[PDB]
């Protein structure tokens, strides 16, 4: 059984949450769309590396065939980064919190080419604010984003994948129960959190 320091699967996902990355943005000097995009691209390059590090620490992940591990990251990596982005944003508004030293507030949103590049990602934060998602709900949902990005039958370890996925769904079930207690609305909450997860995989391919 799980040690008392980390007695639930969700508390292991809390242990592997990476430290937030800083963008390296000046902020002493004035903003330009060019400065933001150039810094943002460097930041996204490192967040991809951090997201592969995080996925490889998820309990169960390293037990999939290495082709399955690569396939899952291939089909979910940017969706995972956008989901983390929505959460950070949510926790601070109608802002995009790319990094603590790089927040796209309403003013920066009006810099040229900035809103039209950003608009889509604002969906995520508003849905998390609309559903008042908890930290534990967020950690389960994020792991499931990684595990719901490819059909079981398009993978090599179909059976093991399916079992690990079902474990993470149940852990989400328990984050729901912990937050809002047991009720008839608990299935509704489960429907609206998993539908949210279905949106994040749209427009991947």
Ligand X SMILES: C[C@H](CCC(=O)NCCC[N+](C)(C)CCCS(=O)(=O)[O-])[C@H]1CC[C@H]2[C@@H]3[C@H](O)C[C@@H]4C[C@H](O)CC[C@]4(C)[C@H]3C[C@H](O)[C@]12C
Residue ranges binding its own copies (CB under 8 A): 32-34, 38, 41, 45, 48, 74-75, 77-78, 110-116, 203-205
Q: Does 85 bind ligand 486 (CB under 6 A)?
A: yes
Options 12, 78, 160, 177; binder of ligand 486; rule CB under 6 A: 78
| Residue from 118, 160, 169, 177 in contact with Cl ion (CB under 5 A) | 160
- Given 3, 4, 19, 45, the residue binding ligand 486 (CB under 6 A): 45
- Distance separating alpha carbons of residues 197 and 75, to the nearest angstrom: 14
Task: Among 2, 7, 20, 34, indicate the residue that binds ligand X (CB under 6 A).
Answer: 34
Cα–Cα distance, 143 to 156 (Å, whole number): 19
Say which entry of ligand 486, ligand X, its own copies, none residue 75 contacts (CB below 5 to 8 A, set by partner kind). its own copies
Phi–psi pair at 182, nearest 5 degrees = -85, 135
Given ligand X, its own copies, Cl ion, none, residue 70, with its beta carbon under 5 to 8 Å by kind, binds: ligand X
Site for Cl ion in 59-118 (CB under 5 A): 74, 111
Token pair recorded at residue 54: 């995080």
DSSP letters along 147-191, please? HTSS-GGGSSSHHHHHHHHHHHHHHHHHHHHHHH-SSSHHHHHHH
3-state helix, strand, coil in the chain (%, to 5): 65, 5, 30
User: Rounded to the nearest whole angstrom, what is the least distance from the CB of residue 24 to ligand X in the complex?
Assistant: 16
Q: Which two tokens stand for residue 13?
A: 């996902």
Residue 118 parent element (H or E): helix 114-118
Helices 77-91 and 185-200 cross at an angle (nearest 10°) of 120
Sites of contact with ligand X (CB under 6 A): 32-34, 48-49, 52, 70, 73-74, 77-79, 82, 113, 116-117, 120-121, 123-124, 199-200, 202-203
Sites of contact with Cl ion (CB under 5 A): 32-33, 74, 111, 157, 159-160
């Amino acid at each position: 059984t799980l040690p008392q320091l980390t007695p639930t699967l969700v508390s292991l996902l809390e242990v592997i949450e990476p430290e937030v990355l800083y963008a390296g943005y000046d902020g002493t000097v004035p903003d330009t769309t060019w400065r933001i995009m150039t810094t943002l691209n460097m930041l996204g390059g490192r967040q991809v590396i951090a997201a592969v590090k995080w996925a490889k620490a998820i309990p169960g992940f390293r037990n999939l065939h290495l082709d399955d591990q690569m396939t899952l990251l291939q089909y979910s990596w940017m969706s995972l980064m956008a989901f983390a982005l929505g959460w950070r944003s949510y926790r601070q508004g109608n802002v995009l919190c790319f990094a603590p030293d790089l927040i796209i507030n309403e003013q920066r949103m009006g810099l040229p080419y900035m809103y039209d590049q950003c608009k889509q990602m604002l969906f995520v934060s508003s849905e998390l604010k609309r559903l008042q998602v908890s930290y534990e709900e967020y950690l389960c949902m994020k792991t499931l984003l990684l595990f719901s990005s490819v059909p079981k039958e398009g993978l090599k370890s179909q059976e093991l994948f399916d079992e690990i996925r079902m474990t993470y769904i149940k852990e989400l079930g328990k984050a729901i129960v912990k937050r809002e207690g047991n009720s008839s609305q608990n299935w509704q909450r489960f429907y609206q959190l998993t539908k949210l997860l279905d949106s994040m995989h749209e427009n991947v391919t």
